[model samples]
Target: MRISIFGLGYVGAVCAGCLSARGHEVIGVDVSSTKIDLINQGKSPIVEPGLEALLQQGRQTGRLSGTTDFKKAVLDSDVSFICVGTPSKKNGDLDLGYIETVCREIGFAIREKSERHTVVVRSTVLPGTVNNVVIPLIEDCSGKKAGVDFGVGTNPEFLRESTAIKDYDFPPMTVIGELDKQTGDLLEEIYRELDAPIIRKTVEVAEMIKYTCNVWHAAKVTFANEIGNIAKAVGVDGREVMDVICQDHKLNLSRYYMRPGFAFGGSCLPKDVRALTYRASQLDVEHPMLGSLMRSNSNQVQKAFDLITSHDTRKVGLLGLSFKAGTDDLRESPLVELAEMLIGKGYELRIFDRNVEYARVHGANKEYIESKIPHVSSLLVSDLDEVVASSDVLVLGNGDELFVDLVNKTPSGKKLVDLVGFMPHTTTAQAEGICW
Candidate 1:
């Protein structure tokens, strides 16, 4: 399990120490003489808690090595991890010059090696960098085919600078976006001591997942700050407020309502966002994040309307009208909004939602749909077959379990505007997923 880490910076330094601690032979490679000197002297090149101590432990066991030679490092180890910096440019793009240099160096070394080598990119780059940039440069230099002559993969780091050594040891998960399973397995075996989920993905998806986590972290920080701003203006304890918000693991503190779906509706979500933002406005609190929710929700609704209009067909069939599937509620539903817009534009619309109809014939349901969207009362149909046959365009609303099968049977030539992803995606079919 010998390995070469291409950079002796923060990620590389921590990885070399932690991997050595877990019984892997780790060689650190760097261009800097100072970093090479530090690692050789059993000291960490970067400041992370317990990193230097662990490097000393590995040095004592004769499992740790450090050198300025890239060729020797690549030849000695089974795999090489590209852990170099991809610091931001003036325009916010990554400065990938360091990465390109390492790739060429490794590619040159890989050309001379008789045995097949593996290169795992542990640096954070854009999604297609591994495929479009890394593999192509290495192949051109080595005169060898990737996934055949050599292996390429991406294993992005989740290490926070302050607790980098600890984060490396106990990462939330291990993600390997390998070109093939053989390379993925080699990278996977390196992390055998860690107690975490080992997730295998495409190189690009693995690259994208790293950004999703990082952007979410940044957003969470901003959200907390904005909420604190509003809370401070109203004489409320922001810390206490956020502490309680964190306790709701079923929704608030967890992955509930985090998915990219249709605009949220029903009575609760739309009403709550408006009410909270209004309170902030009344207090003269400039809560941009909170204030922006309504506009964002409206944008999604507008997107749905735009999607409907994009089709050339006029007879539009809406599958569901309620804010949610299996619900009789139509209050603040984006489907209701879409219908109002479509009908006003002189497009003949046929609606077939049994839940809305069930609510239409009943008590409080009767009052809401009649009061909210009175035009919808006469347009409701009893059968799904009647709507599907008459309309040239179908607007599939809400993820009703029943609609999944119905959407599959939708005939050819009819454009589908999937407000909710009720149908399974296939390249062969004339269907589109709303978010995807």
Candidate 2:
């Protein structure tokens, strides 16, 4: 395989070094004559450890070269990787001028080539940049269609700065955002030596995966710093606290609660967050992220309310009213809050929770429901079918396994709002998901 990498920055330089070392004939392209000179002399432009050695190895084996001639590089290679820097503007938006210039140059260069050239964007841009900006620019410049005459894709780099060469060889995973099968196949072949799982997705999802990983890293650091601050105030070792937190991989360090859904309003989460943030405030510790939990949760409820009302329909039937399923605990339940909101707005709401219905009759929570939320208690229906029949809008409030068939049972002309992923397999015109 022959490959050309644009931009002799950290990402591009390391890619050229590693890919060439992997036995691919590699060409490093850049606007800087000094960088190209260094690369051609079997030296690394960047200071990453073991990179110059890899480049030297490639050069020694006649598998790598460097040039400022973008046309010749494109003509020589089967795949072109756009590894140009996407720097930030004054307002924090991406300055894509370098990438645009490179794209146009590659586009024009590939116009004369008979073989179908594949372009993989290894630069970190926003989600829609590949399909919206790169494809259009290349198509216009080359006078050819993407995925037809040429191939375009995104392969975001996960290499860290100091250990870039090692990271390239032993990545956590390889992501290929493919616009065409040929492009994906070519990239998979390029990374075939790495012992990592290859995840194939659309270009947009691949673009976002890069940002999501980076932002999650940033958030984790901030969270640990805030916890350290509060821990110091309480005379505890923050490292020890975090060590214990990380040990619980089943829940804390795992993907247990990492999802997009309605507000988290079980008995523990809402209460613990409030208690911890309150103590942090009392100790004069500022935790913006921790403090924003309740507000963000409230906003989700408001967002659900807005989505429900946006359809211009009245009479909403809410399925599963407890904080979650399999329990009658209505304490801090978001469904209860949503039901109250609907009833207060005179929307003619009906509620159906199988557990809550049973609790009303015989469970220990019967007294709590009868005394605290008597008005809400009156709206509980014994039959799920009756709730569907009475309401024009049906809200699937929780992930009870029984509610999975609600989408199929829902009649036409009735809007279905899924706060939980009850109907995971179905998408209908009349159905809306809070987040899919």
Candidate 3:
């Protein structure tokens, strides 16, 4: 495959060298004469490790070249990778000046060239950039329609600076956001030998995924530093604590609570979070990230309330109102708080929980519900049919086994607001998930 990279910076230089090493003919294109001269002399313009040797090998095999001519580079290559930089603006928005310039140049070059070309943007951009900006500019400049006269796709880079060569070869995943299937297939063939999972999605989703990864990485670093500070204040080794935390791959270091759903409740999570933050506060330790845990959880509860109130329905039915399924413990459950608020709002409400009714007359269950929310005790229904039959709107409060079929059996006029996403199939008129 003949490939041309637009920028000779870190991303472009590494990509050119690595692709050339993989037996593809690569051409590095730049407006700077110094970069072109360096690449032509078998030297890397960037300072990444192992880049000079790869460039030397590519130059020796006659598989790599550098030039300042955009027209010749676009005409000679089957595909072009736009690897320009998108810096931050004063107001924190992305500056797309460099990217727009490259697109305009490529568009003009494509107009002069006769063969169909594929342009893959390997730059980090905001969502809807390709559809809203890049494609429109290319089409207007080239006087041709995309996916017909030419192809466009987004292949975001996940490379680190120092180990860019190895990261490019062994990425965590390969994401290809394409406007059409033909362009996606062409780009996938370029990485056919890699072992990473190939995810084909929309260009907007692909762009958002890169930001999500980066933001989550930043949040994890802040959280770890806060915990380290708290540990140091208590005379405990933060590194050892983190080592133990990472070892619990089942929940802590895993994808257990990574889904977008309702606020976390249950006795363990809310209680432990409060206790830890309270201890940190008492010690005069300013654990901002740790202190914000309960506040964030409360905000999610408010989000659920807002979703429910957005419908403006008066009669509501709550299914599985315990903190979660498979438990009768309702103390400090976010759903119970939601129920209390709804009742105070003068809305007609009905509740049903399979576990709560069985333990209602005995043990701590009856005492807890009576003490906290005694006024709504009359709203409790013995069977699921009672709650489903009486209300104008239904709330699936938890992922209980019984509520999975509620979407199929829901009446025509009633709306189902799912907090746990119990139902897999949803119709727009009758069903909606809180997060989905």
Candidate 4:
């Protein structure tokens, strides 16, 4: 495959060198004459491990070249990669001037070409950039339709600065955001030699993946640093504490609690977060990331209340009362708080959790229910069918399998509120999800 890469910066230069070393005809296009001269002379324009050797290898094998002529580069290659920099503006918005100029140049160059050419962006951009900006500019300049006259796509890079060559060779995964199958296939062929799984998605989702990875990395660094600050202040080694935390892959480093949904309210999470943040404050250690957890969690419960009120229904039925399903413990349960709010506002409410109902009368929580807040305990209804039939709005409060059928087949004139995504893919006109 013949490939042309625009913007001979770090990303573009590494790609040009590596792809050429893999026996592909590679032409690098840039505005800098000095960078072009360096590449043409079998020397690296930027410093990187094993990059100069690869460029030298490409030059010796007669498969690599650099040019300032964008038109000739496009004419000589079947695919073009936009590897230009997207620098930050003073206001923190992206300065897309480089991306805009390169896109327009490619568009004009492909205006008279007879064969179909695929353009893939390897630059980091926000979602909708390729669909909204890149393809539109190219179409306006070329007078040709994307995905018909030509192909447009996104191939975001996951390479780090120093380990770029190895990262390219052994990436965790390769993502291709394609407008058409032809473009996806062409880009996939370029990476077929690498040992990584290939994921194909829409252009916008692919564009967003790069930002998510980078931001998640940034968040992890801050989280570790904050935890270290608190640990050192408390006469403990933060590295050892973090090492033990990372060992629990089943829950600590897993996707068990990664889902986006309602507020987290159990005995352990809310209590522990408060304790840790309070200790950090007492120690004079700033833990902004950890400190914001309780506030954000409380805001989610408020959001649920707002959503329920938006339906304009008074009679309410809460399907689950426990913090989670399969438990009778009501300590720090978010549903309990929600129910108390509804009752205080003079809304007719019936709570129907079998576990809670049993616990209220004959179980271990009987004393707490009778003495702590008998007003709430009196509202517990044993019959689930009675609660469903008497209420105008049904709220599924937990991930109980029993609520799946009723929630999915909601009766007419009844509004359904799903706090947990029991049926994640099913959303109807009368249903609302806190986070879907």
Give per-residue CA lDDT, model 4, range 260-327, as digits (tens).
Answer: 77888879999999999999999899988999998898898888888787777799998998899998
Candidate order (lDDT): 2, 4, 3, 1
For residues 103-195, could you state the per-residue lDDT of candidate 3 as single tens digits?
Answer: 999999999879999899999999989998999998999998999889999999899999999999999999998887878999899887899
Question: 151, model 2: CA deviation in Å?
Answer: 0.4
lDDT accuracy of residue 213 in candidate 1 = 95
Clashes of each: 0, 0, 0, 0
Candidate 1 least-lDDT 10 residues: 420-429
| Candidate 2 residue lDDT tens string, 138-244 | 99999899998999999999999999988888999999999899999999988877899999999988988899999999999999999999999999999999999
Please identify model 1 stretches exceeding 4 Å from their true place.
365-368, 426-429
In order, candidate lDDTs are: 0.86, 0.90, 0.88, 0.89
Tens-digit lDDT track of model 1 for 6-117: 9989888888888888788999999999998988899976677888899999899998899999999999998999999999999999889999999999999999999999
Error of 1 at 139 (Å): 1.0
Q: Which 10-residue span in candidate 2 carries the lowest summed lDDT?
A: 420-429
User: TM-scores of the models, in the given order?
Assistant: 0.94, 0.97, 0.95, 0.93
Is candidate 1 or 4 superior in lDDT? Answer: 4
Model 1 clash tally, residue pairs: 0
The candidate that wins on lDDT is 2
What range of 10 consecutive residues in model 3 has the weakest lDDT sum?
421-430
Model 3, stretches more than 4 Å misplaced?
Answer: 423-427
Error of 3 at 407 (Å): 2.4
